[PDB]
Amino acid sequence: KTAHSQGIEGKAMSEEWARYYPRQFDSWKKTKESDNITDMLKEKPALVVAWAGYPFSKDYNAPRGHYYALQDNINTLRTGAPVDGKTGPLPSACWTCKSPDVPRIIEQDGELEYFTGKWAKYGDEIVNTIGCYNCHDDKSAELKSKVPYLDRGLSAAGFKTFAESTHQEKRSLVCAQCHVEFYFKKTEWKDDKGVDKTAMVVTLPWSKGISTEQMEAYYDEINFADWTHGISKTPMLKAQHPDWELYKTGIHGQKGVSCADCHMPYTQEGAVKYSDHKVGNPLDNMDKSCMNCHRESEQKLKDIVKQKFERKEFLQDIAFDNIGKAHLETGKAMELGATDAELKEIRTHIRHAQWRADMAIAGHGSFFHAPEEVLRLLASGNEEAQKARIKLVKVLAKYGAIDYVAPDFETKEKAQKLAKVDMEAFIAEKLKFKQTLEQEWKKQAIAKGRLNPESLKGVDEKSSYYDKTKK
Ligand code: HEM
Ligand code: HEM
Ligand code: HEM
Ligand code: HEM
Ligand code: HEM
Ligand SMILES: O=S([O-])[O-]
Ligand SMILES: [Ca+2]
Ligand SMILES: [Y+2]
Ligand SMILES: [Y+2]
Ligand SMILES: [Y+2]
């Protein structure tokens, strides 16, 4: 039994746990060290074309430390510039995987209420970043999943629920609360006051299983689209960081190595074992993360991982080049008068191409967690894109444009022009929001005692559109 067996007052604030667990608190805070903003649209402008019509064509950066999760959720151009709790582009579900205030609010408002309304609804309540309470019971300190959709997905896929799982399984499932592919299911409900409401509920598309193809079948069966492509008008699916799903296809996952084994390695100090809570790049800490199971040098292992990254990059660039061209060629065919009927098969190929390729690349560790599945997925996605392009030549020819050359999209700026993203306008609007409503949110949360200003140190120095140069 713990020193906090009746629970922790202010449990959503990780600082409240520090008195009991100073070591884990200290290492947990060190994800502040991982402050790099890598603008993935700048690095891979083909993604802008892939995501035309979708917020990821505005702003999409690589992950950084958990310390920044909440602030990055606020800063991303994807969440736009609300003026109040009823405005802004995105729904309340966007907080879900960013904050320990999420289970706090779910446990208080209920899941459906939590999932009802705009992201801006909770701006002055959801103010702590990924914290102890996202993964731990505040009485027993045991690992817990705090979000109902995970068990729902696990059960749908025929897996054991969190509670039914082994400890070693839980050491990955706590991560899978967030590091999974999801969609928002529009969910009609009626509250305690009999008011009809609409929730957008985080849902794991796992009822046919957790392979990319099973999820593709799932989404096709329900005719789901995350958006209609801004160039090709294809019904598109967006993959989001299927880190756990793909990790399950990989040899380490198959062998029962948990996320925590690599990302939260143990340090043994006499009779006491401590987990490193600085969740980051295991390659920064290889003696602890890798070398308990692997012999021979760190450099050789690093070199092998680099080769995996390079193979993935090679296939990713091919697949997304063909995907981008297919979108653009479809847009051209549309401009010339090609009908939806004439483009239907093409669009299905593009949807599947991009679903598979996005699923391969959307988990930034998948190239390592499941290298062979990632390569197969990129190859499969590229094949679908090329089938679309072969069919597109014929449609273009029918409309007198067989010699059409899809425009180049080799810089973010050129790609964003093709995707009709006025990023300057979005940035200007965003800055106004940050300078006004965001600061009101933080001021109110501090006044109410939901937010400790200590947690804000260095948290808002960088985004894809500013860098105060300090983080
Ligand atoms: C032990 C389980 C977990 C592992 C192994 C893990 C792994 C990671 C890693 C390696 C990163 C990038 C870190 C860096 O660049 O330095 C990251 C970022 C992120 N993780 Fe986790 N994670 C876990 C649990 C969670 C949970 C439970 C959530 C949701 C509550 C979550 C949400 C996120 C988010 C939102 C980011 C991006 C933060 C940002 O860019 O601001 N993770 N995670
Ligand atoms: C559409 C609503 C959401 C928004 C606006 C949002 C925003 C963000 C942002 C800004 C990042 C940092 C990287 C980037 O710039 O893209 C991020 C990363 C991440 N988000 Fe979300 N998020 C949303 C929904 C979710 C949900 C529901 C989950 C969990 C089920 C989740 C889990 C994660 C994870 C695990 C990462 C780090 C891994 C990665 O970026 O590949 N996010 N999110
Ligand atoms: C500052 C906030 C946190 C505190 C005070 C805390 C506390 C603890 C404690 C006391 C332990 C057991 C001793 C140890 O292995 O070090 C532990 C382990 C662990 N925690 Fe945390 N934790 C925090 C944040 C998190 C978060 C956010 C996650 C999930 C993303 C997480 C996931 C885990 C995992 C996977 C283990 C290993 C469990 C095991 O191997 O038995 N912790 N943590
Ligand atoms: C489902 C469980 C796991 C989750 C949620 C997870 C999460 C992540 C994430 C989000 C990244 C990308 C980090 C970034 O882009 O900044 C990553 C990369 C990586 N992970 Fe994992 N991981 C898991 C399992 C594992 C395991 C079991 C190992 C060791 C065998 C491992 C080792 C690595 C390595 C070597 C990288 C590449 C370096 C990096 O980008 O940080 N991961 N992981
Ligand atoms: C980030 C640290 C690690 C790195 C860089 C790493 C690297 C690798 C590589 C390159 C492979 C070949 C499989 C493939 O083609 O992807 C592999 C396999 C394997 N690794 Fe790791 N690994 C790490 C962590 C771990 C840990 C923590 C464990 C044990 C808890 C482990 C146990 C295994 C096992 C059992 C295999 C299957 C081959 C065999 O049976 O020996 N690895 N690892
Ligand atoms: O936007 S979140 O799912 O990466
Ligand atoms: Ca999705
Ligand atoms: Y306290
Ligand atoms: Y990173
Ligand atoms: Y392999």
XYZ file of C-alpha atoms and ligand atoms in Angstrom:
694
model
C 0.000 0.000 0.000
C 1.137 3.514 -0.830
C 1.657 6.691 1.189
C -1.384 8.136 -0.630
C -3.810 5.247 -0.231
C -6.880 7.471 -0.008
C -5.913 9.276 -3.212
C -4.198 12.487 -4.141
C -5.853 15.885 -3.842
C -5.156 17.679 -7.134
C -4.184 14.354 -8.756
C -4.369 15.702 -12.309
C -1.455 17.993 -11.489
C 1.644 15.809 -11.635
C 3.346 18.159 -9.194
C 1.030 16.725 -6.538
C 2.677 13.331 -6.934
C 6.174 14.698 -6.399
C 5.969 14.417 -2.633
C 5.559 10.650 -2.939
C 7.656 9.897 -5.984
C 10.356 12.533 -6.343
C 12.517 10.320 -8.588
C 9.845 9.493 -11.177
C 8.631 13.066 -11.037
C 12.139 14.345 -11.777
C 12.671 12.025 -14.739
C 9.140 12.625 -16.029
C 9.826 16.380 -16.107
C 12.958 15.833 -18.153
C 10.979 15.273 -21.358
C 11.261 19.090 -21.377
C 14.688 18.325 -22.854
C 13.127 17.028 -26.050
C 12.037 20.408 -27.376
C 12.848 20.171 -31.100
C 10.136 21.163 -33.548
C 10.703 19.296 -36.801
C 8.236 20.617 -39.319
C 7.288 17.504 -41.265
C 5.551 19.484 -44.006
C 8.843 21.248 -44.609
C 10.726 17.957 -44.583
C 8.144 16.020 -46.607
C 6.141 18.498 -48.635
C 4.439 15.622 -50.441
C 2.453 15.240 -47.229
C 0.850 18.638 -47.845
C -0.528 17.360 -51.135
C -1.590 14.091 -49.470
C -3.458 16.052 -46.834
C -4.947 18.798 -48.976
C -8.321 19.637 -47.535
C -7.307 18.415 -44.078
C -5.750 20.302 -41.184
C -2.490 18.377 -41.411
C -1.782 20.274 -44.622
C -1.473 23.403 -42.409
C 0.788 22.190 -39.637
C 2.281 18.813 -38.868
C 5.385 18.427 -36.792
C 7.242 15.444 -35.437
C 6.546 14.482 -31.835
C 8.639 15.958 -29.089
C 8.644 15.495 -25.355
C 5.509 14.771 -23.394
C 6.253 18.031 -21.534
C 5.076 19.893 -24.624
C 2.048 17.829 -25.532
C -0.609 20.167 -24.201
C 1.124 23.274 -25.485
C 1.682 21.755 -28.914
C -1.998 20.908 -29.043
C -2.675 24.598 -28.364
C -0.023 25.870 -30.752
C -0.656 23.736 -33.776
C -2.379 25.565 -36.573
C -4.706 22.562 -36.675
C -6.629 23.782 -33.628
C -6.980 27.219 -35.228
C -8.039 30.314 -33.446
C -11.140 30.041 -31.295
C -12.551 33.292 -29.899
C -14.586 31.539 -27.207
C -15.659 28.080 -26.049
C -17.977 27.597 -29.020
C -15.588 28.380 -31.865
C -12.489 26.999 -33.557
C -12.250 24.201 -36.110
C -11.715 21.131 -33.926
C -13.695 19.233 -31.297
C -13.083 18.526 -27.641
C -11.627 15.114 -28.511
C -8.418 16.878 -29.451
C -7.453 17.210 -25.783
C -7.850 13.512 -25.108
C -4.288 12.351 -25.456
C -2.591 15.462 -24.184
C -3.466 15.844 -20.524
C -4.235 14.218 -17.198
C -7.108 16.708 -16.945
C -8.814 14.522 -19.521
C -9.559 11.584 -17.214
C -10.320 14.167 -14.507
C -12.995 15.727 -16.751
C -14.303 12.375 -18.016
C -14.627 11.104 -14.428
C -16.593 14.286 -13.616
C -18.551 15.285 -16.805
C -18.845 11.725 -18.167
C -17.314 10.462 -21.421
C -20.093 11.641 -23.741
C -20.170 15.149 -22.258
C -16.391 15.297 -22.460
C -16.650 14.403 -26.151
C -19.296 17.042 -26.811
C -18.423 20.492 -28.048
C -15.419 22.323 -29.375
C -11.801 21.953 -28.381
C -12.130 25.508 -27.022
C -14.771 24.291 -24.528
C -12.086 23.068 -22.149
C -9.332 25.601 -22.698
C -9.307 26.718 -19.069
C -9.721 23.225 -17.621
C -7.386 21.030 -19.644
C -4.160 22.693 -18.750
C -1.714 20.075 -17.527
C 0.358 18.034 -19.885
C 0.735 14.230 -20.001
C 1.053 13.356 -16.370
C 1.202 10.723 -13.671
C -2.546 10.545 -13.617
C -2.671 9.505 -17.265
C -1.024 6.223 -16.369
C -1.330 5.644 -12.631
C -4.051 5.036 -10.114
C -3.833 7.832 -7.540
C -4.455 5.456 -4.623
C -2.455 2.357 -5.519
C -0.046 3.872 -8.066
C -0.705 0.826 -10.242
C -0.668 1.206 -14.008
C -4.116 2.020 -15.351
C -5.671 2.973 -18.618
C -7.686 6.099 -17.908
C -9.554 6.302 -21.196
C -12.562 4.102 -21.947
C -11.945 3.733 -25.702
C -8.819 1.617 -25.242
C -10.568 -1.312 -23.557
C -13.412 -0.852 -26.060
C -10.904 -1.270 -28.887
C -9.057 -4.122 -27.213
C -12.296 -6.057 -26.681
C -13.434 -5.309 -30.249
C -10.171 -6.803 -31.556
C -10.494 -9.842 -29.303
C -7.618 -8.789 -27.031
C -7.764 -8.898 -23.238
C -8.867 -5.667 -21.574
C -6.283 -3.686 -19.628
C -7.338 -5.234 -16.291
C -7.239 -8.756 -17.809
C -3.755 -8.222 -19.251
C -0.391 -9.214 -17.823
C 1.791 -6.619 -16.146
C 4.149 -6.727 -19.140
C 1.180 -6.148 -21.478
C 0.117 -3.185 -19.322
C 3.610 -1.742 -19.773
C 2.652 -1.213 -23.406
C -1.075 -0.608 -23.027
C -0.569 2.493 -20.881
C 1.088 3.953 -23.981
C -1.655 2.632 -26.236
C -4.122 4.943 -24.556
C -2.661 7.533 -26.905
C -0.191 5.981 -29.291
C -2.784 4.344 -31.489
C -4.797 5.030 -34.619
C -8.240 6.445 -34.003
C -11.131 8.240 -35.555
C -13.950 10.360 -34.205
C -17.314 8.609 -34.241
C -20.213 11.038 -34.402
C -22.347 9.939 -31.491
C -25.849 11.142 -30.756
C -26.845 11.122 -27.104
C -29.122 12.774 -24.538
C -27.790 14.182 -21.259
C -29.113 14.170 -17.659
C -31.359 17.129 -18.568
C -32.787 15.349 -21.630
C -30.947 17.697 -24.011
C -30.016 16.129 -27.355
C -26.284 16.438 -27.931
C -23.690 15.247 -30.420
C -20.392 13.831 -29.228
C -17.340 13.167 -31.392
C -15.962 10.119 -29.673
C -12.436 8.790 -29.933
C -12.805 5.307 -31.336
C -10.184 2.711 -32.218
C -11.036 1.131 -35.563
C -10.021 -2.282 -34.328
C -13.170 -4.408 -34.613
C -11.739 -6.382 -37.559
C -8.319 -6.520 -35.967
C -5.313 -4.222 -35.745
C -3.645 -4.733 -39.122
C -3.699 -1.877 -41.586
C -5.775 -3.989 -43.959
C -8.237 -4.944 -41.246
C -8.668 -1.299 -40.308
C -9.008 -0.428 -43.995
C -11.789 -3.014 -44.271
C -13.353 -1.588 -41.120
C -13.424 1.924 -42.500
C -14.571 0.828 -45.958
C -17.402 -1.204 -44.467
C -18.786 1.870 -42.719
C -17.972 4.107 -45.727
C -15.997 6.360 -43.445
C -13.850 9.268 -44.562
C -11.886 11.661 -42.415
C -12.118 14.236 -45.191
C -12.796 14.706 -48.872
C -9.519 15.409 -50.557
C -9.128 19.053 -51.509
C -7.551 18.228 -54.855
C -8.814 14.827 -55.915
C -12.112 14.755 -53.989
C -11.187 11.256 -52.841
C -12.837 10.006 -49.615
C -9.716 9.907 -47.523
C -8.590 8.167 -44.387
C -6.073 9.737 -42.051
C -3.705 7.495 -40.140
C -2.595 8.765 -36.775
C 0.436 7.295 -35.050
C -0.579 3.598 -35.028
C 2.432 3.102 -32.823
C 1.049 0.249 -30.744
C -0.769 -1.479 -33.597
C 2.351 -1.656 -35.720
C 4.601 -2.434 -32.764
C 2.436 -5.579 -32.352
C 3.483 -6.705 -35.853
C 7.144 -6.225 -35.131
C 9.538 -8.778 -33.802
C 10.055 -6.994 -30.479
C 6.276 -6.837 -29.933
C 5.984 -10.477 -30.950
C 8.713 -11.400 -28.454
C 6.846 -9.552 -25.650
C 9.230 -6.587 -25.280
C 7.038 -3.734 -24.001
C 7.149 -0.040 -24.942
C 8.417 0.548 -21.412
C 11.350 -1.816 -21.853
C 12.904 0.465 -24.427
C 11.376 3.817 -23.612
C 11.299 3.564 -19.801
C 14.244 1.325 -18.948
C 14.967 0.285 -15.375
C 17.805 1.457 -13.180
C 18.594 -0.982 -10.350
C 19.827 0.605 -7.121
C 20.273 -2.162 -4.569
C 16.861 -3.524 -3.633
C 15.083 -0.686 -5.489
C 14.249 -0.600 -9.198
C 13.283 2.708 -10.867
C 11.754 3.282 -14.288
C 13.198 6.141 -16.292
C 10.169 8.347 -16.916
C 12.018 10.530 -19.423
C 10.177 9.024 -22.354
C 12.239 9.864 -25.420
C 14.595 8.418 -27.987
C 15.859 5.036 -26.681
C 18.937 5.495 -28.877
C 20.015 8.344 -26.567
C 20.244 5.795 -23.750
C 21.256 2.516 -25.354
C 23.162 0.870 -22.529
C 19.862 0.888 -20.580
C 17.399 0.626 -23.480
C 19.021 -1.996 -25.741
C 22.115 -3.552 -24.238
C 20.406 -5.711 -21.607
C 19.274 -7.895 -24.516
C 21.800 -7.120 -27.232
C 25.524 -7.816 -27.394
C 28.039 -5.922 -29.607
C 28.450 -2.161 -29.926
C 25.997 0.701 -29.592
C 27.320 2.136 -32.844
C 26.598 -1.047 -34.826
C 23.039 -1.178 -33.476
C 22.594 2.550 -34.210
C 23.861 1.892 -37.743
C 21.306 -0.893 -38.233
C 18.503 1.400 -37.108
C 19.757 4.096 -39.471
C 19.638 1.611 -42.364
C 16.026 0.840 -41.446
C 15.231 4.533 -41.453
C 16.847 4.943 -44.865
C 14.884 2.051 -46.364
C 11.671 3.504 -45.040
C 12.541 6.981 -46.373
C 13.256 5.515 -49.794
C 9.891 3.804 -50.048
C 8.034 6.633 -48.357
C 9.264 9.179 -50.860
C 8.304 6.934 -53.771
C 4.867 6.176 -52.383
C 4.021 9.770 -51.542
C 5.316 11.034 -54.831
C 2.935 8.720 -56.651
C 0.161 9.498 -54.219
C 0.696 13.248 -54.756
C 0.782 12.848 -58.497
C -2.343 10.734 -58.389
C -4.192 13.408 -56.438
C -3.032 16.113 -58.824
C -3.820 14.085 -61.926
C -7.272 13.355 -60.542
C -7.757 17.090 -59.932
C -6.707 17.734 -63.517
C -9.091 15.085 -64.805
C -11.843 16.739 -62.774
C -10.988 20.136 -64.266
C -11.335 18.621 -67.740
C -14.767 17.208 -66.879
C -14.102 13.647 -65.744
C -17.126 12.278 -63.906
C -17.290 10.776 -60.444
C -18.187 7.471 -62.097
C -15.072 7.640 -64.285
C -12.952 8.439 -61.236
C -14.473 6.061 -58.707
C -11.974 3.205 -59.026
C -9.094 5.669 -59.188
C -10.279 7.320 -55.997
C -10.602 4.004 -54.211
C -7.028 3.175 -55.196
C -5.877 6.582 -53.920
C -7.765 6.169 -50.652
C -6.187 2.787 -50.067
C -2.767 3.842 -51.283
C -2.651 6.694 -48.864
C -4.226 4.818 -45.995
C -1.538 2.173 -46.271
C 1.325 4.578 -46.788
C 0.118 6.899 -44.017
C -0.311 3.967 -41.656
C 3.287 3.007 -42.466
C 4.759 6.443 -41.727
C 2.381 8.052 -39.225
C 4.033 6.147 -36.370
C 7.444 7.766 -36.279
C 9.018 4.756 -34.652
C 7.357 2.147 -36.814
C 10.292 1.975 -39.216
C 12.078 0.441 -36.233
C 9.234 -1.155 -34.263
C 7.957 -3.086 -37.280
C 10.379 -2.518 -40.142
C 9.158 -5.271 -42.454
C 5.509 -4.367 -42.064
C 6.362 -0.707 -42.731
C 8.200 -1.595 -45.953
C 5.396 -3.915 -47.039
C 2.818 -1.223 -46.345
C 4.721 1.413 -48.298
C 5.134 -1.037 -51.187
C 1.439 -1.920 -51.037
C 0.411 1.728 -50.858
C 2.659 2.624 -53.767
C 1.200 -0.199 -55.829
C -2.291 1.147 -55.225
C -1.160 4.660 -56.176
C 0.404 3.372 -59.368
C -2.726 1.432 -60.269
C -4.584 4.712 -59.876
C -2.034 6.516 -62.044
C -2.215 3.951 -64.840
C -5.988 4.376 -64.848
C -5.571 8.147 -64.695
C -3.523 8.213 -67.901
C -6.547 6.794 -69.678
C -8.960 9.276 -68.157
C -6.609 12.139 -68.990
C -6.276 10.814 -72.526
C -10.041 10.655 -72.887
C -10.139 14.365 -72.034
C -7.281 15.307 -74.335
C -4.582 15.709 -71.705
C -2.498 12.561 -71.973
C 0.710 14.610 -71.840
C -0.258 16.386 -68.622
C 2.546 16.625 -66.123
C 1.363 16.990 -62.519
C 2.938 20.053 -60.914
C 5.907 19.706 -58.647
C 5.477 19.876 -54.921
C 9.035 19.676 -53.713
C 8.828 22.520 -51.228
C 6.287 23.148 -48.520
C 5.466 26.502 -50.071
C 4.811 25.054 -53.510
C 2.805 22.185 -52.026
C 0.735 24.489 -49.836
C -0.082 26.603 -52.864
C -1.395 23.506 -54.638
C -3.355 22.619 -51.522
C -4.654 26.222 -51.297
C -3.408 26.679 -47.759
C -3.046 30.334 -46.798
C -0.673 29.537 -43.989
C 0.154 33.243 -43.424
C -3.516 33.980 -42.676
C -3.770 30.966 -40.396
C -0.656 32.023 -38.517
C -1.873 35.588 -38.087
C -5.204 34.351 -36.701
C -3.438 31.852 -34.463
C -1.146 34.483 -32.967
C -4.138 36.664 -32.134
C -5.739 33.686 -30.370
C -2.566 32.922 -28.461
C -2.114 36.522 -27.408
C -5.692 36.827 -26.169
C -7.872 33.807 -25.431
C -5.046 31.386 -24.712
C -3.601 33.732 -22.124
C -7.044 34.103 -20.582
C -7.315 30.319 -20.392
C -4.007 30.051 -18.570
C -4.793 32.988 -16.284
C -8.160 31.481 -15.347
C -6.730 28.003 -14.823
C -4.006 29.439 -12.560
C -6.550 31.480 -10.632
C -8.744 28.395 -10.124
C -5.752 26.304 -9.046
C -5.948 23.907 -12.000
C -2.602 25.020 -13.390
C 0.722 25.653 -11.679
C 2.723 28.285 -13.594
C 5.835 26.220 -12.872
C 4.634 23.774 -15.514
C 4.741 26.522 -18.161
C 8.466 27.118 -17.942
C 9.889 27.115 -21.457
C 6.780 25.362 -22.713
C 5.824 27.947 -25.340
C 9.083 28.961 -26.950
C 8.673 27.093 -30.224
C 6.135 26.023 -32.796
C 6.444 25.458 -36.537
C 5.800 29.212 -37.023
C 7.857 30.846 -34.278
C 10.974 30.137 -32.312
C 11.819 32.457 -29.425
C 15.122 30.528 -29.565
C 15.321 29.332 -25.959
C 13.365 26.120 -25.347
C 5.090 4.590 -21.718
C 4.171 4.769 -22.712
C 4.523 5.789 -23.806
C 5.563 5.784 -24.653
C 6.688 4.737 -24.828
C 5.491 6.995 -25.422
C 6.382 7.380 -26.375
C 6.494 8.665 -26.855
C 7.658 9.192 -27.506
C 8.952 8.401 -27.718
C 7.399 10.452 -27.865
C 8.362 11.432 -28.546
C 9.311 11.926 -27.451
C 10.400 12.824 -27.964
O 10.385 13.243 -29.141
O 11.291 13.147 -27.147
C 6.057 10.743 -27.445
C 5.385 11.910 -27.679
C 4.054 12.043 -27.427
N 3.246 11.163 -26.689
Fe 3.802 9.457 -25.817
N 4.387 7.700 -25.022
C 3.751 6.993 -24.031
C 2.605 7.367 -23.397
C 1.782 8.376 -23.835
C 0.462 8.674 -23.346
C -0.238 7.877 -22.226
C -0.019 9.717 -24.060
C -1.381 10.421 -23.912
C -1.829 10.782 -22.679
C 0.999 10.100 -25.002
C 0.898 11.107 -25.925
C 1.948 11.644 -26.609
C 1.884 12.887 -27.334
C 0.680 13.805 -27.509
C 3.251 13.158 -27.842
C 3.672 14.366 -28.659
C 4.060 15.481 -27.688
C 4.432 16.707 -28.466
O 4.895 16.646 -29.624
O 4.233 17.786 -27.872
N 2.081 9.267 -24.845
N 5.517 9.636 -26.828
C -7.784 16.119 -33.894
C -7.566 16.341 -32.549
C -6.093 16.395 -32.150
C -5.210 17.396 -32.302
C -5.441 18.820 -32.850
C -3.935 16.910 -31.853
C -2.778 17.637 -31.867
C -1.541 17.070 -31.828
C -0.293 17.764 -32.031
C -0.168 19.256 -32.365
C 0.695 16.859 -31.938
C 2.201 17.084 -32.061
C 2.734 16.641 -33.424
C 2.065 17.411 -34.540
O 2.399 18.620 -34.690
O 1.181 16.827 -35.247
C 0.093 15.592 -31.618
C 0.781 14.418 -31.465
C 0.235 13.266 -30.986
N -1.098 13.056 -30.702
Fe -2.597 14.335 -31.092
N -4.068 15.607 -31.427
C -5.387 15.250 -31.610
C -5.965 14.055 -31.281
C -5.291 13.024 -30.697
C -5.892 11.875 -30.056
C -7.399 11.626 -29.915
C -4.888 11.092 -29.626
C -4.948 9.755 -28.852
C -5.847 8.776 -29.141
C -3.647 11.725 -29.972
C -2.408 11.254 -29.710
C -1.248 11.809 -30.122
C 0.023 11.156 -30.048
C 0.294 9.766 -29.474
C 1.007 12.111 -30.617
C 2.504 11.872 -30.742
C 2.820 10.876 -31.864
C 2.863 11.510 -33.226
O 2.680 12.751 -33.362
O 3.107 10.733 -34.189
N -3.916 12.914 -30.601
N -1.266 15.742 -31.573
C 5.464 12.377 -12.518
C 4.443 11.536 -12.806
C 4.620 10.037 -12.512
C 4.854 9.462 -11.330
C 5.025 10.129 -9.942
C 4.952 8.043 -11.563
C 5.206 7.088 -10.611
C 5.635 5.817 -10.881
C 6.081 4.846 -9.916
C 6.141 5.095 -8.404
C 6.426 3.724 -10.555
C 6.941 2.395 -9.952
C 8.433 2.452 -9.677
C 9.220 2.551 -10.958
O 9.181 1.593 -11.784
O 9.903 3.588 -11.144
C 6.192 3.951 -11.962
C 6.430 3.068 -12.981
C 5.889 3.190 -14.229
N 5.190 4.281 -14.735
Fe 5.036 6.056 -13.819
N 4.765 7.795 -12.903
C 4.535 8.999 -13.508
C 4.283 9.208 -14.835
C 4.013 8.204 -15.722
C 3.328 8.315 -16.987
C 2.785 9.625 -17.601
C 3.277 7.091 -17.536
C 2.640 6.651 -18.869
C 2.911 7.241 -20.046
C 3.904 6.172 -16.622
C 4.057 4.829 -16.836
C 4.774 3.995 -16.031
C 5.231 2.692 -16.422
C 5.020 1.946 -17.751
C 5.966 2.166 -15.224
C 6.651 0.811 -15.065
C 5.695 -0.070 -14.277
C 6.383 -1.370 -13.977
O 7.353 -1.724 -14.687
O 5.954 -2.015 -12.990
N 4.354 6.886 -15.533
N 5.720 5.233 -12.124
C 3.833 0.390 -28.415
C 4.954 0.507 -27.665
C 5.833 1.670 -28.105
C 5.464 2.947 -28.259
C 4.099 3.584 -27.974
C 6.610 3.660 -28.752
C 6.623 4.969 -29.112
C 7.553 5.487 -29.974
C 7.445 6.730 -30.702
C 6.252 7.696 -30.628
C 8.553 6.890 -31.424
C 8.914 8.047 -32.366
C 9.703 9.077 -31.555
C 9.853 10.406 -32.271
O 9.471 10.538 -33.459
O 10.373 11.367 -31.648
C 9.398 5.731 -31.189
C 10.625 5.516 -31.750
C 11.495 4.532 -31.374
N 11.214 3.520 -30.475
Fe 9.429 3.115 -29.662
N 7.657 2.772 -28.890
C 7.200 1.543 -28.478
C 7.915 0.371 -28.427
C 9.265 0.327 -28.586
C 10.122 -0.798 -28.272
C 9.611 -2.129 -27.675
C 11.369 -0.441 -28.550
C 12.652 -1.291 -28.397
C 12.714 -2.556 -28.865
C 11.359 0.906 -29.066
C 12.439 1.614 -29.505
C 12.346 2.716 -30.319
C 13.409 3.206 -31.147
C 14.828 2.634 -31.314
C 12.842 4.415 -31.862
C 13.554 5.309 -32.889
C 14.207 6.493 -32.200
C 13.228 7.622 -31.958
O 12.653 8.155 -32.941
O 13.007 8.012 -30.776
N 10.062 1.338 -29.052
N 8.758 4.904 -30.303
C 16.243 0.557 -28.465
C 16.913 -0.553 -28.087
C 16.967 -1.760 -29.044
C 17.459 -1.807 -30.291
C 18.132 -0.661 -31.073
C 17.237 -3.152 -30.767
C 17.584 -3.628 -32.017
C 17.139 -4.823 -32.526
C 17.233 -5.229 -33.914
C 17.862 -4.355 -35.012
C 16.679 -6.436 -34.016
C 16.531 -7.271 -35.307
C 15.027 -7.333 -35.578
C 14.656 -6.377 -36.661
O 14.912 -6.752 -37.813
O 14.111 -5.272 -36.415
C 16.234 -6.856 -32.703
C 15.611 -8.033 -32.376
C 15.352 -8.485 -31.106
N 15.528 -7.766 -29.929
Fe 16.049 -5.804 -29.850
N 16.589 -3.881 -29.799
C 16.427 -3.051 -28.707
C 15.840 -3.384 -27.510
C 15.553 -4.652 -27.088
C 15.148 -5.065 -25.752
C 14.953 -4.106 -24.557
C 14.954 -6.388 -25.766
C 14.520 -7.335 -24.605
C 13.769 -6.951 -23.559
C 15.261 -6.852 -27.107
C 15.205 -8.148 -27.526
C 15.154 -8.541 -28.840
C 14.699 -9.838 -29.275
C 14.194 -10.994 -28.388
C 14.828 -9.793 -30.796
C 14.468 -10.920 -31.782
C 15.742 -11.610 -32.240
C 16.213 -12.513 -31.133
O 15.460 -13.440 -30.733
O 17.352 -12.295 -30.654
N 15.616 -5.769 -27.888
N 16.512 -5.829 -31.825
O -3.072 14.801 -34.142
S -2.732 13.740 -33.198
O -3.479 12.498 -33.443
O -1.416 13.244 -33.686
Ca -7.363 8.000 -38.067
Y -0.462 17.749 -2.083
Y 10.959 13.563 -31.366
Y 13.930 -7.445 -39.498
